[PDB]
Amino acid sequence: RKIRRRQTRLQKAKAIFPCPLQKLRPSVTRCSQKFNLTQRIGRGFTLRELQGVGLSAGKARQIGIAVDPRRKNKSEESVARNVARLKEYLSKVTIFSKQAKPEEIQQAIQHQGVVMP
Amino acid sequence: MKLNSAVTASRRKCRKAYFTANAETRAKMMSSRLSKELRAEHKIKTMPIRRGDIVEIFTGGHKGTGKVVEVRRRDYKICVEGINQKARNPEAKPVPYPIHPSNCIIKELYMNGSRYRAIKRRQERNAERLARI
Amino acid sequence: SKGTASFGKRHTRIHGSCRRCGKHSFHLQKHECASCGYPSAKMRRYNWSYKSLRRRTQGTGSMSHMRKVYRAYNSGTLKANARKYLAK
């Protein structure tokens, strides 16, 4: 099974060679008073957080940010956490368009693993 | 060693494949060493055995040279004219002693035309290999 | 007269050959096959007997068409499929 998942992962990576396999996901307080101190990765950035950066949900998905309308920040501090995560990703991301630009694409380097862990 | 998984290294699978193989594969399995003189002329180490070939046995008892009168691929053996079991009765028809073709060196080949075409195909393929692939 | 004499009064053919399964299982009086199930459209398969299912099923015959079409799927049947999906 381990070899199979890597082989499926390698095949998928090549299909979107410049793009990272994992989409950007949000830092989220782990639930319960047991883990309320720590933070983990959530399904998607809230519409308010994307609005704070200035990205619409559809435009954000193209950049690579997963969007969850369901999530509500529940705080003003939670929004700040994610808006800063979104801001950093926007700097790290480079949009390769210009029809075909093979030389830039060859050295693109696909990010591997979870983005901004 | 073998780095390819497709080929089987099992004694059971290997023996069944040899014991029951298609005639095209029986042919290559029944190849024999081209002589030093022939090798220099044709640049092929071993060519498959034919029914006009004259061959010199080099190991088994009965080490003489004769034309290959018959090839029985089912028995995986070839019969060479003049190498037979001792006919008990003097006035009796000879029974050939089959020799394996590995035990033989091909002194002469039946040239044919397909044999010549086959010899050439290998000569150009071996040249690609000799060109270090 | 429970055994020998009673067996001696037998001269009848309760069972007969089946149309669908060619076995001496077709009752002549009831018009049904003990093994084939004919005249039922569906065939008689009961998971109480693993052996009975194995005695007659796929692979117990020529498998003519299926073999020929399975071989084609490892060849050019799949290319023919792609052409049909796209235009014809």
């Binding site: 979107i16 410049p18 793009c19 990272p20 559809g58 435009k59 998905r61 193209q62 950049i63 690579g64 990703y89 790290k92 991301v93 480079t94 949009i95 390769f96 368009s97 694409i105 693109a108 380097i109 696909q110 990010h111 983005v115 | - | 079409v69 084609a72 799927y73 049947t77 023919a80 499929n81 052409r83 049909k84 999906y85 796209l86 014809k88």
Partner: protein, 120 residues
Amino acid sequence: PGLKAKDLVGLSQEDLQRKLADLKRELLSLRTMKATAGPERIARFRVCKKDVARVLTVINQKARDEARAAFEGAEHIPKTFRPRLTHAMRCQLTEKQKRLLPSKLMKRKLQFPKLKYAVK
């Protein structure tokens, strides 16, 4: 030793129909002879049987070729000439139909196209 199909390919259907009848009368003759005689290995018998098949393959191939040409580019074509496919492939939605999407959905795909991107 049997009539090469290359030669029958190069014939007329009427000549092929005549040839088949002659082979069939010969096939009767060989059958009469083998039964009457009490054997010669009957080598022609075996060859003739293959040459009744060879001639009839040619006659089918000509007929299929003539019929297929008549039934061409027409909705509703004789089933025998229909693409082999398989029962399920015949019944599967065309890739254009499978890809068919609602107008609102298509509008969004155009609005936000796939972008190539890379991250540090």
